[PDB]
Design a protein around this motif. Structure first.
Motif, PDB file in Angstrom:
ATOM      1  N   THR A  69     -14.174 -22.913   9.873  1.00 49.42           N
ATOM      2  CA  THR A  69     -15.325 -23.797   9.327  1.00 49.42           C
ATOM      3  C   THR A  69     -14.797 -24.618   8.301  1.00 49.42           C
ATOM      4  OG1 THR A  69     -17.115 -22.585  10.299  1.00 49.42           O
ATOM      5  CG2 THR A  69     -17.628 -24.191   8.590  1.00 49.42           C
ATOM      6  N   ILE A  70     -14.241 -24.055   7.258  1.00 47.49           N
ATOM      7  CA  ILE A  70     -13.675 -24.719   6.096  1.00 47.49           C
ATOM      8  C   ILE A  70     -12.291 -25.638   6.424  1.00 47.49           C
ATOM      9  CG2 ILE A  70     -12.176 -24.024   4.073  1.00 47.49           C
ATOM     10  CD1 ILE A  70     -13.590 -21.261   3.738  1.00 47.49           C
ATOM     11  N   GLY A  71     -11.479 -25.188   7.363  1.00 42.19           N
ATOM     12  CA  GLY A  71     -10.521 -25.920   7.707  1.00 42.19           C
ATOM     13  C   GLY A  71     -10.919 -26.892   8.321  1.00 42.19           C
ATOM     14  N   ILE A  72     -11.827 -27.002   9.385  1.00 45.18           N
ATOM     15  CA  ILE A  72     -12.241 -28.475   9.911  1.00 45.18           C
ATOM     16  C   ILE A  72     -12.589 -29.053   8.908  1.00 45.18           C
ATOM     17  CG2 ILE A  72     -14.602 -27.494  10.264  1.00 45.18           C
ATOM     18  CD1 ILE A  72     -14.433 -29.428  12.882  1.00 45.18           C
ATOM     19  N   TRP A  73     -13.464 -28.830   7.794  1.00 42.44           N
ATOM     20  CA  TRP A  73     -13.886 -29.784   6.775  1.00 42.44           C
ATOM     21  C   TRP A  73     -12.564 -30.332   5.987  1.00 42.44           C
ATOM     22  CZ3 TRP A  73     -17.666 -32.437   5.360  1.00 42.44           C
ATOM     23  CH2 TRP A  73     -17.723 -33.031   3.962  1.00 42.44           C
ATOM     24  N   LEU A  89      -3.675 -30.322   0.356  1.00 43.94           N
ATOM     25  CA  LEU A  89      -4.293 -28.897   0.785  1.00 43.94           C
ATOM     26  C   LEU A  89      -5.107 -28.204  -0.479  1.00 43.94           C
ATOM     27  CD1 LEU A  89      -4.466 -27.068   2.741  1.00 43.94           C
ATOM     28  CD2 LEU A  89      -2.347 -26.050   2.315  1.00 43.94           C
ATOM     29  N   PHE A  90      -4.624 -28.185  -1.585  1.00 41.32           N
ATOM     30  CA  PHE A  90      -5.188 -27.474  -2.744  1.00 41.32           C
ATOM     31  C   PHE A  90      -6.386 -28.305  -3.406  1.00 41.32           C
ATOM     32  CE2 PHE A  90      -1.600 -24.378  -4.020  1.00 41.32           C
ATOM     33  CZ  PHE A  90      -1.481 -23.740  -2.631  1.00 41.32           C
ATOM     34  N   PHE A  91      -6.486 -29.678  -2.972  1.00 41.45           N
ATOM     35  CA  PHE A  91      -7.624 -30.315  -3.548  1.00 41.45           C
ATOM     36  C   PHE A  91      -8.914 -30.267  -2.591  1.00 41.45           C
ATOM     37  CE2 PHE A  91      -5.374 -32.336  -6.985  1.00 41.45           C
ATOM     38  CZ  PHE A  91      -4.104 -32.357  -6.600  1.00 41.45           C
ATOM     39  N   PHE A  92      -8.753 -30.056  -1.458  1.00 39.74           N
ATOM     40  CA  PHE A  92      -9.755 -29.990  -0.607  1.00 39.74           C
ATOM     41  C   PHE A  92     -10.886 -29.077  -0.919  1.00 39.74           C
ATOM     42  CE2 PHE A  92      -6.453 -31.553   2.341  1.00 39.74           C
ATOM     43  CZ  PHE A  92      -6.681 -32.781   2.433  1.00 39.74           C
ATOM     44  N   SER A  93     -12.145 -29.161  -0.486  1.00 41.28           N
ATOM     45  CA  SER A  93     -13.242 -28.359  -0.977  1.00 41.28           C
ATOM     46  C   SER A  93     -14.327 -28.250  -0.249  1.00 41.28           C
ATOM     47  CB  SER A  93     -13.483 -28.506  -2.375  1.00 41.28           C
ATOM     48  OG  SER A  93     -14.521 -27.302  -2.938  1.00 41.28           O
ATOM     49  N   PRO A  97     -24.818 -26.953  -1.335  1.00 42.96           N
ATOM     50  CA  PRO A  97     -25.788 -28.162  -1.139  1.00 42.96           C
ATOM     51  C   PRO A  97     -25.849 -28.365  -2.808  1.00 42.96           C
ATOM     52  CG  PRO A  97     -26.442 -26.309   0.293  1.00 42.96           C
ATOM     53  CD  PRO A  97     -25.276 -25.818  -0.843  1.00 42.96           C
ATOM     54  N   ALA A  98     -26.613 -29.774  -2.887  1.00 41.19           N
ATOM     55  CA  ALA A  98     -26.948 -30.061  -4.397  1.00 41.19           C
ATOM     56  C   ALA A  98     -27.956 -29.528  -4.844  1.00 41.19           C
ATOM     57  CB  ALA A  98     -27.106 -31.634  -4.463  1.00 41.19           C
ATOM     58  N   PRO A  99     -28.265 -29.332  -6.319  1.00 43.20           N
ATOM     59  CA  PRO A  99     -29.293 -28.695  -6.887  1.00 43.20           C
ATOM     60  C   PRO A  99     -30.602 -29.187  -6.467  1.00 43.20           C
ATOM     61  CG  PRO A  99     -27.936 -29.240  -8.545  1.00 43.20           C
ATOM     62  CD  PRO A  99     -27.270 -29.897  -7.104  1.00 43.20           C
ATOM     63  N   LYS A 110     -22.683 -32.516   6.059  1.00 42.59           N
ATOM     64  CA  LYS A 110     -21.681 -32.848   5.200  1.00 42.59           C
ATOM     65  C   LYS A 110     -21.960 -32.878   3.634  1.00 42.59           C
ATOM     66  CE  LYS A 110     -19.876 -36.472   8.163  1.00 42.59           C
ATOM     67  NZ  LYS A 110     -19.819 -38.286   8.223  1.00 42.59           N
ATOM     68  N   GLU A 111     -23.327 -32.440   3.347  1.00 45.41           N
ATOM     69  CA  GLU A 111     -23.552 -32.248   2.089  1.00 45.41           C
ATOM     70  C   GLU A 111     -24.067 -30.655   1.653  1.00 45.41           C
ATOM     71  OE1 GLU A 111     -26.336 -35.650   2.077  1.00 45.41           O
ATOM     72  OE2 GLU A 111     -25.029 -36.483   0.297  1.00 45.41           O
ATOM     73  N   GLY A 112     -23.546 -29.668   1.997  1.00 40.48           N
ATOM     74  CA  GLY A 112     -23.987 -28.263   1.965  1.00 40.48           C
ATOM     75  C   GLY A 112     -24.445 -27.628   3.115  1.00 40.48           C
ATOM     76  N   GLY A 113     -24.806 -28.141   4.235  1.00 38.98           N
ATOM     77  CA  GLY A 113     -25.205 -27.458   5.415  1.00 38.98           C
ATOM     78  C   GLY A 113     -24.056 -26.759   5.888  1.00 38.98           C
ATOM     79  N   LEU A 114     -22.868 -27.306   6.018  1.00 37.83           N
ATOM     80  CA  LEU A 114     -21.676 -26.692   6.399  1.00 37.83           C
ATOM     81  C   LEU A 114     -21.163 -25.591   5.652  1.00 37.83           C
ATOM     82  CD1 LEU A 114     -19.987 -27.445   9.000  1.00 37.83           C
ATOM     83  CD2 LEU A 114     -18.459 -28.720   7.525  1.00 37.83           C
ATOM     84  N   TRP A 115     -21.410 -25.794   4.297  1.00 39.03           N
ATOM     85  CA  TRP A 115     -20.917 -24.504   3.340  1.00 39.03           C
ATOM     86  C   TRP A 115     -21.866 -23.524   3.589  1.00 39.03           C
ATOM     87  CZ3 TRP A 115     -23.812 -21.556  -0.032  1.00 39.03           C
ATOM     88  CH2 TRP A 115     -23.157 -20.885  -0.672  1.00 39.03           C
ATOM     89  N   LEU A 116     -23.231 -23.711   4.076  1.00 46.28           N
ATOM     90  CA  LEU A 116     -23.997 -22.666   4.367  1.00 46.28           C
ATOM     91  C   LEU A 116     -23.719 -21.820   5.471  1.00 46.28           C
ATOM     92  CD1 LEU A 116     -27.574 -24.238   3.424  1.00 46.28           C
ATOM     93  CD2 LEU A 116     -26.579 -22.137   2.312  1.00 46.28           C
ATOM     94  N   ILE A 117     -23.122 -22.581   6.423  1.00 48.02           N
ATOM     95  CA  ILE A 117     -22.744 -22.121   7.754  1.00 48.02           C
ATOM     96  C   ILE A 117     -21.436 -21.158   7.542  1.00 48.02           C
ATOM     97  CG2 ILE A 117     -21.602 -22.584  10.213  1.00 48.02           C
ATOM     98  CD1 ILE A 117     -23.313 -25.179  10.171  1.00 48.02           C
ATOM     99  N   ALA A 118     -20.347 -21.561   6.774  1.00 47.19           N
ATOM    100  CA  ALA A 118     -19.231 -20.803   6.592  1.00 47.19           C
ATOM    101  C   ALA A 118     -19.496 -19.492   5.759  1.00 47.19           C
ATOM    102  CB  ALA A 118     -18.133 -21.892   5.692  1.00 47.19           C
ATOM    103  N   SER A 119     -20.378 -19.861   4.819  1.00 46.27           N
ATOM    104  CA  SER A 119     -20.897 -18.595   4.084  1.00 46.27           C
ATOM    105  C   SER A 119     -21.759 -17.434   4.845  1.00 46.27           C
ATOM    106  CB  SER A 119     -21.905 -19.242   2.996  1.00 46.27           C
ATOM    107  OG  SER A 119     -21.092 -19.931   1.989  1.00 46.27           O
ATOM    108  N   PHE A 120     -22.615 -18.218   5.707  1.00 44.64           N
ATOM    109  CA  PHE A 120     -23.160 -17.166   6.819  1.00 44.64           C
ATOM    110  C   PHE A 120     -21.908 -16.360   7.452  1.00 44.64           C
ATOM    111  CE2 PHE A 120     -24.594 -16.081  10.789  1.00 44.64           C
ATOM    112  CZ  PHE A 120     -25.565 -15.053  10.668  1.00 44.64           C
TER     113      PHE A 120
END
Ligand SMILES: CCCCCCCCCCCCCCCCCC(=O)OC[C@H](COP(=O)([O-])OCC(O)COP(=O)([O-])OC[C@@H](COC(=O)CCCCCCCCCCCCCCCCC)OC(=O)CCCCCCCCCCCCCCCCC)OC(=O)CCCCCCCCCCCCCCCCC
Ligand code: BCL
Ligand code: BCL
Ligand code: BCL
Ligand code: BCL
Ligand SMILES: CC[C@H]1c2cc3[nH]c4c(c3C)C(=O)[C@H](C(=O)OC)c4c3nc(cc4[nH]c(cc(n2)[C@@H]1C)c(C(C)=O)c4C)[C@@H](C)[C@@H]3CCC(=O)OC/C=C(\C)CCC[C@@H](C)CCC[C@@H](C)CCCC(C)C
Ligand SMILES: CC[C@H]1c2cc3[nH]c4c(c3C)C(=O)[C@H](C(=O)OC)c4c3nc(cc4[nH]c(cc(n2)[C@@H]1C)c(C(C)=O)c4C)[C@@H](C)[C@@H]3CCC(=O)OC/C=C(\C)CCC[C@H](C)CCC[C@H](C)CCCC(C)C
Ligand SMILES: COC1=C(OC)C(=O)C(C/C=C(\C)CC/C=C(\C)CC/C=C(\C)CC/C=C(\C)CC/C=C(\C)CC/C=C(\C)CC/C=C(\C)CC/C=C(\C)CC/C=C(\C)CCC=C(C)C)=C(C)C1=O
Ligand SMILES: COC(C)(C)C/C=C/C(C)=C/C=C/C(C)=C/C=C/C(C)=C\C=C\C=C(C)\C=C\C=C(/C)CC/C=C(\C)CCC=C(C)C
Ligand SMILES: CCCCCCCCCCCC[N+](C)(C)[O-]
Ligand SMILES: CCCCCCCCCCCC[N+](C)(C)[O-]
Ligand SMILES: [Fe+2]
Ligand SMILES: [K+]
Lengths: 301, 281, 239
Positions: A69-73, A89-93, A97-99, A110-120
């Motif tokens: 999930t992180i890699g595709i991003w 490579l080291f700059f990608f992140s 989600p925003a506050p 693209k704004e936090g949802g994908l982070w939540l998925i990876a984290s899950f």
């Protein structure tokens, strides 16, 4: 020159060791992997077998989903360009989600949802793996020290991406998935909380981290120093103390005035290491929830 | 007093200097020539710190701080109250540490064991020396060394680090940290494994090394072995310190700009430097 | 303040943890004794922990510690001073008497067993499937002592079956008998195996094993202690 026993002089090999059976479900053990003569100069040359039951399959699947999930991003940020993927490579992140979204899951992918998925996926991977450390020990009739020790590391991890963010009221507080970005996050965290060097739990965590290198250097060196007496066969030195354990104890008694036992040193070891993340988790959890600025807190304490 | 099994090992011999002159114990402590040397260096150092405390005007443990000569003094000497005391105390510290290591060597000789411990300790000593001697000398002034104060030395760490931006970007520093984290990981695992075998489930017999190998192969598909784990713990801890010393010896000497910018060499590689897209395009 | 309570609380916990750890490390070697073997007056502020019992596999019994401590062997040493804290001189040949760096512990006179109940250490010739997989095979090489004289030849390697590693080199002496040498105390070279710890004339003195196909913990200790003892006591013979 004297042989120092850092690297073996001669390797020997016999039938692949399939391990102890006890209560283990052999159906879940793979065959042995290849043998590495390279590894054999330092440690065991044998690879495998490994145990992979249902829980293990879940953990690996979930862990890989996290990684992918992180890699595709990352590829996305690279414009799907292989050359760009490698140079930046080291700059990608993958950021949280925003506050504004608080602790909700209504943030765009693209704004936090994908982070939540990876984290899950990561949450399932780590906890199911923890279950693995407990069950593999149980199946062998062994103590649960490994699972308990792993919990300490899990504690810091949980505080950082789950417990603290929830207490702070937003996922924006969590750590981003990126090489340089999680480092920037770390520096920023200290800056914003008044300099972590003023957090007493951070100072303790440092003492234990340095203490772990001091202790493993001490212990590793001691065992190697008495390996000429079979010192590394620790379980038997515990059950039947030999001259190896006695010389190890006396080297330290004569050096610093006190010493340990073959079993006890491993208790100093597990706690020294475990206290690193135990104190650390507490230090981070209190940051921003109870103490906004450690320098200020230290002035009143 | 002696441990129940201690007397048979308390024989004469092993000293490196003085023959039997200092070949004896004080309670549990072995003395030896270097035991006397360590006491001398340590006592003097502690006395000079107390004197530095008097010149500073405080006896509080958390306030006492001995600072090295200001940069203006370069690598020359300085008045006691202005960096000289730091200079003498540093000599005493070095003498005490080296003497402590040599005393360990005499203890190894009497006990007939390997010299791995003092050898490992020498790495810590070398890291200390990199910060108070090698780096300052290469940079041209003692003032670059850290002060001897519980809290003031942390100020030095913070100030020194931010002098190069976020110090996290120092590549040698990244490697050192990797070794420190991996070492603690390995220490917890080693302690937990031995203990889990020696203290199995209630009522069961002690597990064996076979069970230890089996547990890890079952868990991750590999077991390094009992000899290997001790070789590893030693290698990880020493490597962590080696890269710590390295990350600092190159800072302010061969590299003195913002560490984050060092990474430009990779991004600016001809074959992709100008390719559009990504974070750097 | 919650943080204040936490840190104050942690230090209390740490003091208790250290107390616990120190007492745990007193399960061997205590109570402290005077040089004459009687209980010392000062035992320190830490008390002995309650006994724990280890259940040993394969019917070997149990081990309870702390427990009555005793060397269970004669110690051929005598005081060299009229007060405590000084060295104790060997009354005879320290190598033969097993004192100083040549010390051995009276461990159980049985072989260590693997998880299946079989002898952990065995000569390679008797370990089905085992063979040298990398490095110079020492078998067949002459063995040289620190006096630079050949003391024998390697006739086998004793291996730790469970951990699959070389533990001892079996060396045959001129009289035809053999002795075990710790792997950690030999240097395997292209044309020979060098032993810095012993001079050629001291190999015959290495303790022998009862059975040619196994070694007990007691015998391992006597063998390892004797070889290591040579570093200090064979020094005169070492070139
Ligand atoms: C907020 C913080 C939240 C953070 C959560 C993360 C938790 C991480 C915990 C890590 C624990 C590592 C412990 C290492 C260890 O030995 O584990 C094996 C140990 C035995 O495992 P086993 O397989 O069951 O037994 C095998 C053999 O039968 C028996 O084998 P054995 O003999 O090896 O085990 C016996 C074991 C028995 O284990 C225990 O008793 C459990 C110890 C748990 C400690 C948890 C740490 C809490 C830190 C609090 C800090 C406070 C600051 C705020 O003995 C000990 O280890 C004793 C510990 C020493 C305690 C000293 C306390 C001093 C208090 C101060 C007194 C005042 C005097 C001073 C003046 O594990 C446990 O007993 C369970 C621990 C579970 C903790 C769950 C926490 C909930 C989350
Ligand atoms: C290596 C990178 C930096 C550095 C960065 C940091 C950071 C960052 C921190 C410390 C912290 C500490 N540092 Mg420092 N520190 C440095 C070099 C040193 C030297 C030295 C001679 O080299 C010493 C003695 C110390 C000592 C200390 C301890 C007071 C404290 C706990 C560490 C610990 O337990 O480690 C493991 C070692 C052991 C467990 C063994 C026991 C060591 C005891 C605790 C040290 C006694 C120090 C003593 C007060 C000196 C006076 C003794 C004489 C009698 C006068 N630092 C270099 C310059 N240090 C922590 C803190 O809270 O500081 C306030 C902390 O957060
Ligand atoms: C400018 C930056 C700030 C600063 C900001 C922070 C912040 C922010 C934190 C620390 C933390 C720590 N700091 Mg600091 N720190 C500073 C300066 C220092 C200095 C120094 C010489 O200056 C030192 C020695 C330290 C030392 C430390 C450590 C004691 C502690 C980390 C414990 C650890 O190892 O966790 C290692 C363990 C984990 C991170 C556990 C999680 C592991 C998970 C469970 C496993 C993942 C598995 C995964 C899914 C799969 C991975 C892939 C496979 C490997 C293939 N800091 C400066 C002042 N520091 C941490 C802490 O606890 O602070 C109190 C922390 O959060
Ligand atoms: C509490 C500490 C801070 C932090 C501070 C730092 C600093 C500072 C550094 C790293 C570095 C690393 N961090 Mg980090 N890191 C944190 C949490 C994490 C987590 C996680 C799930 O919690 C993961 C997987 C990582 C992973 C990593 C690795 C890519 C890298 C090497 C660590 C290592 O030796 O592991 C060993 C474990 C196994 C081999 C198993 N960090 C938290 C937020 N991390 C180092 C690096 O090179 O970064 C580019 C580095 O310098
Ligand atoms: C804002 C600060 C900067 C920063 C600035 C620096 C600087 C500046 C330095 C480090 C150094 C280090 N940093 Mg950094 N660092 C940062 C963030 C981090 C983080 C993190 C989670 O963010 C981590 C994990 C680290 C980790 C590290 C370690 C690799 C290294 C410290 C260990 C060492 O070298 O020991 C080496 C061991 C010793 C120095 C001990 C010597 C011990 C002597 C021989 C014996 C003492 C005996 C004693 C006096 C007797 C006491 C009495 C008895 C107890 C009775 N840094 C931030 C970004 N960092 C240091 C380094 O590499 O130093 C070489 C260093 O100088
Ligand atoms: C591979 C490196 C790791 C390592 C290994 C290591 N350390 C070791 C050893 C080994 C193998 C020992 O054998 C030796 C030991 O005996 O341990 C119990 C030791 C040791 N490591 C120690 C400390 C230590 N090690 C550290 C680190 C490390 N040690 C590394 C992680 C650290 C830190 C900060 O990380 C510290 C604080 C000592 C407890 C002990 C060595 C004791 C010694 O040398 O005593 C002689 C001296 C005195 C008792 C008096 C000194 C008084 C004055 C002369 C000087 C002090 C002035 C000044 C330097 C202090 C400034 C303090 C401020 C910064 C607060
Ligand atoms: C007490 C704290 C220290 C610690 C302990 C620790 N880590 C552990 C354990 C323990 C006791 C395990 O049992 C477990 C393990 O299985 O090790 C082989 C683990 C582990 N520590 C790991 C990583 C790790 N530990 C770290 C740190 C630490 N671990 C601390 C220093 C770090 C960092 C950032 O320093 C990392 C990256 C994993 C390799 C492993 C847990 C594997 C896992 O959760 O996999 C899930 C998903 C996948 C299949 C991956 C894709
Ligand atoms: C399997 O084996 C092993 C053992 O045994 C079975 C061991 O014990 C140990 C040793 C480890 C421990 C006991 C665990 C606890 C140790 C630590 C956590 C490490 C950190 C250490 C300390 C805080 C202690 C520091 C104390 C010191 C250096 C003593 C200084 C004090 C003095 C009063 C003496 C000062 C001086 C001199 C010069 C000596 C001469 C004396 C006179 C002239 C008088 C290890 C590693 C081991 O692996
Ligand atoms: C696909 O492309 C090819 C090349 C195969 C592969 C490319 C992949 C690449 C390059 C992947 C790179 C991955 C990297 C660099 C990952 C880096 C992670 C880092 C540097 C740090 C991690 C810190 C993370 C922490 C502390 C995370 C903590 C997470 C939690 C505590 C769980 C949080 C869970 C949440 C919010 C969900 C809620 C859960 C429930 C119960 C519903
Ligand atoms: C189990 C090992 C015991 C280690 C005890 C470590 C003591 C070092 C304390 C230094 C931390 C100081 N403080 C208040 C600033 O956090
Ligand atoms: C950082 C804390 C680690 C140090 C723990 C120190 C324990 C001192 C134990 C002294 C015991 C002495 N003796 C021989 C009398 O048992
Ligand atoms: Fe060990
Ligand atoms: K064979």
């Amino acid at each position: 020159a004297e042989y120092q026993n850092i690297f073996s002089q001669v390797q020997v090999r016999g039938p692949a060791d399939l391990g102890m059976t006890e209560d283990v479900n052999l159906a879940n053990r793979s065959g042995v992997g290849p043998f590495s003569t390279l590894l054999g100069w330092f440690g065991n040359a044998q690879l495998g077998p490994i145990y992979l039951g249902s829980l293990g399959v879940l953990s690996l699947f979930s862990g890989l989903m996290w990684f992918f999930t992180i890699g595709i991003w990352f590829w996305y940020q690279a414009g799907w360009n292989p050359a760009v993927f490698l140079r930046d490579l080291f700059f990608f992140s993958l950021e949280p989600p925003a506050p504004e979204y608080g602790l909700s899951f209504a943030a765009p992918l693209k704004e936090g949802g994908l982070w939540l998925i990876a984290s899950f996926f990561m949450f399932v991977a780590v906890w199911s793996w923890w279950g693995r450390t407990y069950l593999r020990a149980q199946a062998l009739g062994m103590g649960k020290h490994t699972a308990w020790a792993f919990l300490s590391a899990i504690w810091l991890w949980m505080v950082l991406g789950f417990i603290r963010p929830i207490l702070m009221g937003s996922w924006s507080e969590a750590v981003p998935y990126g090489i340089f970005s999680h480092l920037d996050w770390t520096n920023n965290f200290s800056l914003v909380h008044g300099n972590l060097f003023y957090n007493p739990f951070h100072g303790l965590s440092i003492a234990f981290l340095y203490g772990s290198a001091l202790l493993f250097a001490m212990h590793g060196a001691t065992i190697l120093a008495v390996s000429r007496f079979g010192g590394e066969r620790e379980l038997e030195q515990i059950a039947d103390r030999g001259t190896a354990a006695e010389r190890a104890a006396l080297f330290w008694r004569w050096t610093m005035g006190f010493n340990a036992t073959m079993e006890g040193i491993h208790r100093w070891a597990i706690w020294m290491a475990v206290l690193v993340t135990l104190t650390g988790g507490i230090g981070i959890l209190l940051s921003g929830t109870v103490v906004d600025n450690w320098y200020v807190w230290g002035q009143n304490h | 007093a002696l441990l129940s099994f201690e007397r048979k090992y308390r024989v004469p011999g092993g000293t490196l200097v003085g023959g039997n002159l200092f070949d004896f114990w004080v309670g549990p402590f072995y003395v030896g020539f270097f035991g006397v040397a360590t006491f001398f260096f340590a006592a003097l150092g502690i006395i000079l710190i107390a004197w530095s405390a008097v010149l500073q005007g405080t006896w509080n443990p958390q306030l006492i701080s001995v600072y090295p000569p200001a940069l203006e003094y370069g690598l020359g000497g300085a008045p006691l109250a202005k960096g000289g005391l730091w200079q003498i105390i540093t000599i005493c510290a070095t003498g005490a540490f080296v003497s402590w290591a040599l005393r360990e060597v005499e203890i190894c000789r009497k006990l007939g064991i390997g010299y791995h411990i003092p050898f490992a300790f020498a790495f810590a000593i070398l890291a200390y020396l990199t910060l108070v001697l090698f780096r300052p000398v290469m940079m041209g002034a003692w003032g670059y060394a850290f002060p001897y104060g519980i809290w003031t030395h942390l100020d030095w760490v913070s100030n020194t680090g931010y002098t190069y931006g976020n110090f996290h970007y120092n590549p040698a520093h990244m490697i050192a940290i990797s070794f420190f984290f991996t070492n603690a990981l390995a220490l917890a695992l080693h302690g937990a494994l031995v203990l889990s075998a020696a203290n199995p489930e209630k009522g069961k017999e002690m597990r064996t090394p076979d069970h230890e190998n089996t547990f890890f192969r079952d868990l991750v598909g590999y077991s390094i072995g009992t000899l290997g784990i001790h070789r590893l713990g030693l290698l990880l801890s020493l490597s962590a310190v080696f890269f710590s010393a390295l990350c600092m010896i190159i800072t302010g000497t061969i590299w003195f700009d913002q560490w984050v910018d060092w990474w430009q060499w990779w991004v600016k590689l001809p074959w992709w430097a100008n390719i559009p897209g990504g974070i750097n395009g | 303040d919650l943080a204040s309570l936490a840190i104050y609380s942690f230090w209390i916990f740490l003091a208790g943890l250290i107390y616990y750890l120190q007492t745990e490390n007193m399960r061997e070697g205590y109570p402290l004794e005077n040089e004459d073997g009687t209980p010392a007056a000062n035992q320190g502020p830490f008390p002995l922990p309650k006994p724990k019992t280890f259940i040993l596999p394969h019917g070997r019994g149990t081990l309870t510690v702390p427990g009555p401590e005793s060397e269970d062997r004669p110690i051929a040493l005598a005081r060299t001073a009229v007060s405590e804290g000084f060295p104790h001189a060997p009354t005879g040949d320290p190598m033969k008497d097993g004192v100083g760096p040549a010390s051995w512990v009276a461990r159980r006179d049985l072989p260590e067993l693997d998880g299946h109940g079989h002898n952990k250490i065995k000569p390679m010739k008797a370990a089905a499937g085992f063979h040298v997989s990398a490095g110079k095979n020492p078998i067949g090489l002459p063995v040289r002592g620190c006096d630079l004289e050949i003391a024998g030849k390697v006739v086998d390697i004793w291996v730790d079956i469970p951990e699959q590693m070389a533990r001892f080199l079996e060396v045959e002496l001129k009289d035809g008998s053999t002795r075990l040498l710790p792997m950690q105390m030999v240097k395997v070279q292209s044309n020979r195996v060098h032993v810095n710890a012993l001079s050629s004339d001291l190999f015959a003195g290495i303790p022998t094993i009862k059975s040619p196909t196994e070694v007990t913990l007691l015998e391992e200790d006597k063998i390892c202690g004797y070889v290591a003892g040579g570093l200090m006591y064979a020094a005169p013979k070492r070139k």
